[PDB]
């Protein structure tokens, strides 16, 4: 039975805030289709070839 991840509560309070001290520039890749093959069919030739 899958975990869904590692459980990690947060030390929440009404008066305790966490500020980051150091930062990382990361690079990620996102990929998307833009078009497809421009297929074409001669119905006449296909159905009744000669």
């Amino acid at each position: 039975t899958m975990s869904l991840g590692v459980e990690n509560s947060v030390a929440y309070s009404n008066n305790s805030i966490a500020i980051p001290t150091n930062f990382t520039i990361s690079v990620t890749t996102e990929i998307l289709p833009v078009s497809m093959t421009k297929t074409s069919v001669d119905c006449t030739m296909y159905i009744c070839g000669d």
Partner: protein
């Protein structure tokens, strides 16, 4: 069938008599008189546009 017959370099086995591509369409044939393999290319076709 119909097409253009051309010389080929495909080494058909002695018992082999036909060639087919992924489409199972005839690819090449061996002359019954000369044990030579000839490729079949469908005749040039397409569509005329203006």
């Amino acid at each position: 069938g119909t097409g253009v017959l051309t010389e080929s370099n495909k080494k058909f086995l002695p018992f082999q008599q036909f060639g087919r591509d992924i489409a199972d369409t005839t690819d090449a044939v061996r002359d019954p008189q000369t044990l030579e393999i000839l490729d079949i290319t469908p005749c040039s076709f397409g569509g005329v546009s203006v």
